[model samples]
Target: SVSKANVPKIDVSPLFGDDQAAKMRVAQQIDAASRDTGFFYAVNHGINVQRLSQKTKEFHMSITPEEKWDLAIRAYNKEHQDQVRAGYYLSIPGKKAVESFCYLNPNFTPDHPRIQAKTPTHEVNVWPDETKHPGFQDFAEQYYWDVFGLSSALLKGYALALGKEENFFARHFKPDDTLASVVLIRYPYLDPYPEAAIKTAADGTKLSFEWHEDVSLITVLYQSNVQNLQVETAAGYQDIEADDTGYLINCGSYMAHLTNNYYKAPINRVKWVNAERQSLPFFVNLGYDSVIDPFDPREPNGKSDREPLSYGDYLQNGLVSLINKNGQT
Candidate 1:
């Protein structure tokens, strides 16, 4: 396992600066980091950290199961989408962690043509009653805008590193087509296990949060001081720590497909923690109809081309499969 002493920390401040050379330098570094581990720390990403911290505390404290249920029910009512739209996802004690989330695609509303055509699984932004969850909707949307900017800039960086125009990737994320979200996840402390309780697999492999790779274009996480997050590397599992000024950035399967696997989307999970840990991960995805094919002229053949699936269909199917596999459907 690689120690924190040797983790790759990248300064992305140059991305917000006016100098072209500085921007390219940071882009090249990110490209190398993505190839090396699929994860890295990004400092000076221009997010309002103070505001993010305050809003996270407020939103987490105000959520309730009743409100969550209401939100989900209304959103899913259209064509009876999966239950996950309600925003609360709970698992059998040891199967998976719990989390609350909301979709956040700008300029796309419930009445939009695409939303009208698809189920909530592909088109809604469910939220609790504003009266009960005061400021929750507003805060979540605000946070989405802020993070969207950061993600957009990073996409530009990705393009530059791959020898494409600055707007190369951003162009595909047009207003009505993008899919993104802000998720508040908490892994609660587990009860002590029986002496005979299994800790390792029959082969002696340690167990933790179901290890899976993200399927989005990228994910930006705001981590608390509590430690448990780990990223797998060829060396083994390495702890991912938080820096006051840095947000953890990782590539996702979609990007791997777009880049033909030149970049990586490593497997990661939450190792068991004695104390509860909270995380805010902003998942950025492309529009429902956006193609995942190689966008750059220099892009090479990928190991697997995205299946002949639309983004909306892929996400809807993924959500259902996620709930079914987690034994929560």
Candidate 2:
């Protein structure tokens, strides 16, 4: 059900420089991609992909089996009022081929006011003891901030891409309170199963991720190796190629809603591969309490048919639908 082709690549290096025209040119290309496919490859994204992928590789090595079991994340536990979550997980094969770990913005602490309030879906990060895993926490914390910074820069591109002021989205995000949840995944070797024994959408083992779109505003997906990702287009689902250091960008449902469907969330999936593959997909989000009101480019101050929703509440509800209980998110 998928074909092979190269997704559009946008050079975002200009986003980091002080050239306004350069940034707008990049933004225009981004706008085209968003309208056409809602997905594109972002080159010169200013991220240290090698170091992050290496850390992800290390986190899933042989030393992690025991830790995975101990740090297993529960979908919902009656004992814990369905509030239990520990940030590390292994996918049940019937669901798909994957083992993943999740972490929140590293800047938050135990006594932070927002944390003290126990914000929904903005749970404090959980990591293994430093003694057991030397650089796990250190690398994870650094990577979180690193990706967060990049995502912040991209917000400007998105705003300009939509023909809004460069800093229009500045107020919607908060450095200290941004709910950026980053996940590291490992897709180890897996051979094809016999025809009759293969699983179905109840779980798509044949398709590593199955077909779906994200609920976040935008996501920066950095892959280590193996390229089986595909996205739906007017023609059909086509392969997306990735360079060693390029990050794949995809708009999401929230973005579509905010932009009044100017940018529809792209439906993408992965084909199961027989070799090892790994990735780090950082999902960008707005501030927890930020109000997400749809904007109309045609009428700058006009209202959208959709009503406004609180980011935190909307995210929690959106995630439950996108997720399969006791399965991958």
Candidate 3:
């Protein structure tokens, strides 16, 4: 248990500057910080605060159940391809889905039809009715672009911190390569277990979001700040606070590998259930074309040796394998 300690407020703005000294400092800081905490609060990131705030509000406020269902069905129908587009499935309060993983590759364009498929999910995404929601499309675009910059910037820092040129990692993330999105998921809280609450699992002291690490490079979340998000460390589980409007950065499995496991991926959860909770998580990854494998020049590995993976393939294999397994065929 954390002893009510104040989390470290790391100044990460130096990573964003163009100065060599600043970049170097960022490199040293990242190297030290990742080794110690494996987590840090990013400040001076270029993501627009007003935009994130607006998008967060809209994401939470927009999309009624009817609109949501309509949009999901519309996208499914638009495919004209008879396939099970994997998408949002509301869970029963008491029922459990051990293998039921929500598959949305947050690194892709939302409008891509192939990002979400049925049995084998595909398609990008289809908005329910942006017309009903003013500035919905604009807000989505803004949020997407902002997240792109933030994720990319952070990736660059990680690369530099790993003793590689910043461009080494940026080469894989061409505009079309990314199939991403920050999910606006809403789970209602009900009392006494709905008899169908299957997925709810035990946390340290209460029912929590369960122990799960993301399959992406990193996931930046913005919640109602209801006090549930926690990450494991040598010091044990600790709450990720937003005291400075700084988003909590959780190193993912890929980040661990990039640094040769010098950075440990923290198992995480969200507890507290007296009321509803809101969160904005930005998931980052190399575009399908960008393999997460460690570069090995001595081996027969080259850019051509790697193949691009679809949203579905990445989601299925990212958590289990360091690389895109079975995607080569």
Candidate 4:
């Protein structure tokens, strides 16, 4: 395990290859990184990066219906436009500096209770008008599922790394209860004296987002050409540089809870310095009804001292608080 200031970078090709020993080796690397720092960068896992880069170009440059829909929706509902389910978010000025779009799990349906209830974070995606962006729904769905596939493969490796069955982690997820969300965020280039945005924290360190932890199991982050993303470590904070060709995977509170604190969920945030920043993260989770039990190797029954919470209720309470904080009911 790397104890240096930098997070370890590991190649994940072995997880997808035919070699068991190689797979184990990669798994150990994952285990060490998780147990020590709770974060790492992965390369060579099976996603077609070249193809994804092309899709991203089309998403940004082409006049897709999804783009038009997002624009129209933002204009139509200006006050509540920042709602995650509404598909857009504008960070609080002078506090956080970012804009993001959230996509619900591709498996979500309009009829689900959470969707029907207009639950925060669990609501069905507010899609763009189809007339303007031909096949926008199909394209968006395809892109989401591709990311989901990538996330699932990565989780399987995590299970293997923990000395559990390959499907151990994935088997907990159910189609209806999957609260996973894919977020696309951009930190724009600061204007009107960009230097003003470089405010210091209480400890005299540069800060963008204040100290916070993710509520999901893991976050698989894909970054563009940007800098100043950092992670908190036992030693101190370390810059998480961008890897245009790979991914930065980090454990979250849920994973730490599930593993009985075997893995640490490092505190992390952005400190926007220069250049506009763009990131795509897949926040993975399980069915709401699923129970998260910590590992107990000593006991005959697989249990621990920690109390288990149903995935659904746990997320609901968190999302409600988050939505309230963001000024929506």
Candidate 5:
């Protein structure tokens, strides 16, 4: 029942002003809206749109057999090297499949743990040497930083929306405890399906992505201005053609739980509906250490009613769950 008007668009870039009043207003809007829609479009988030697009292109083109090998090898530590390599080589999950790499937290500094291990898995992200692709590392690093800042701001907004202090959620999250995943996926238009697959769009006229919700709190997706990206709507799956220099931000299951299900993660899909579409999805896992429990404080812990879960415990379970996906991707 919420329309775009019901969902306020909060421009985050201005909160940095010397005007304390401006910042407070932004916080108030987030708090008021969180209880209702649990979704909003952010503008002026102080990110490099052009740089993001460039890095997105680089990630899209950099997927090669050799690059994959390097990514696998660099992610190894004595404890997990062999297993990590096997998962890399096999490209499948097994007991030895390495779902996560140490890059995110392996050598994290004790101080600033949250920001240090901000998106540990991404820290493990491997890029081809500059010789292989010029500026690959620089672009990737910069893009990560910009998005990380934006994502952190989002968490603050989320906390405010929940009637908690703006930094309430961010401060509680242990630096090393969170799991961050950034997936740079490339979909060539009708870019032929992987092999031996005949799946096509609804009319079979265009390529398409499957209908599934993401597995994180916030799915910050920046995709090509291609016409094929779609979102599930009552009218049908709706085209998600971004506005000029715009990115599409959506919620995931992790966030659904954070808001106590005030928000429902939408069922969605992405296919090569257009001649081609490319996207860089940054998954911000709230990484609380416990599994999500639907119980209210008045209910029992089981399917019955329960209370708030130990945030740390919930996040821990979520990390393990992350490692299990894609057989340890």
Candidate 6:
């Protein structure tokens, strides 16, 4: 059972500087938070939330649901596609009641060989008409690259936290060719807040939001600065404090898997509220084909027999599981 611990607040500003001592402290903070609580508020991480919010609002209002989903590059099944596109039955298990639009790194041009080959994680992003949504593409692309940098900076900490040199991850990662995915999601205020969304536990603990683990290496969530996010703990779910300046950075299934669960994945859910909300979560994943060690090899968390796996396969399978859990295999 996970302990009921308060999520820590970490300032990542040291990562941007040249002082090794400061960087290591920042690194240890993340590692401690990952091991003990699995989530942290990354204040001073240097993301401009004002611009993020303005761009998010502009994109949401400028492009209607019909126009947004048409930009999906993948040819997954109807259910999978529906989940990717908005205004469909995309409610996760227990009807978390969210509609999302996903896009990829701008480098994933349609003509790129990786995209043309239908590579598992190299799909091109679909954008709205340039004329229709002026400046939206620029903002989206800029935000993506900016967040991409933040994710990379955080990984430097992840590297040090694992007892490796800070630059260990830098050797493994190629900046522009990332498998990261970004989504702009809107959580609707279900009138009367349907009962189907609530889950009652074996111990009679009623939960308004059904907690689910994310499928990324780490997920950087910049919500509408609402306090509706609740994270799981042994005692029960605790409300997470939110702010406009920082993002909630949490481990995901991929991170936990690679670390042999020495690092916990943030099991979180959204609380039902009278008002609607929106958020942008960036899924920071490594190169699709990066062969990863299953960490039991490093520190012996168990499962010594676990072998190396390609990041692309791990992420692809995670997506399949999510879609399958929704119904209709």
lDDT of each: 0.66, 0.74, 0.54, 0.67, 0.51, 0.71
lDDT of each residue in 151-255, candidate 6, tens digit only: 878888888787767766655556567778788877667666757666565445555445578878889889886667777777777677766678889888877
Q: Could you tell me how far off, in angstroms, the CA of residue 16 lies in candidate 4 after the best superposition?
A: 3.3
The TM-score values for the models, in the order shown, are 0.82, 0.89, 0.73, 0.81, 0.66, 0.84
In model 1, the Cα lDDT at residue 136 comes to 66
Model 5: residues with Cα > 4 Å off, grouped in runs: 1-9, 17-21, 24-39, 69-123, 173-177, 190-207, 233-236, 287-329
For residues 1-329, could you state the per-residue lDDT of candidate 3 as single tens digits? Answer: 45332344556666666886777777677666666656666767766655655655565455565654444432223543421233433333355211111223433444544344222333544454557777765666667777677777776777777667886666665556554546655545556545433234443345435555666666665555466666666566666664426666767765555444556666775554555555566666555545555542323432223333443366546634522331110
Error of 5 at 314 (Å): 6.3
Best by TM-score: 2
Q: Which is the better candidate, 2 or 3, if ranked by TM-score?
A: 2
Candidate RMSDs in Å, in order, are 4.0, 3.0, 6.7, 4.4, 7.1, 4.2
lDDT of 5 by residue, 232-285 (tens): 656555554454355455667665664556555665655444244456667666
Which regions of candidate 3 fall more than 4 Å away from where they truly are?
A: 4-7, 73-122, 187-204, 292-314, 319-329
Candidate 1: TM-score?
0.82
Question: Ten-residue segment with the worst summed lDDT in candidate 6?
Answer: 81-90
lDDT value for candidate 5? 0.51
Evaluate model 4: give its lDDT: 0.67
Clashes of each: 2, 0, 35, 2, 25, 0
Highest lDDT: which candidate? 2
Q: What is the TM-score ranking, best to worst?
A: 2, 6, 1, 4, 3, 5
Regions of candidate 1 where Cα sits further than 4 Å from its true position: 1-6, 73-86, 90-97, 190-208, 295-310, 317-329
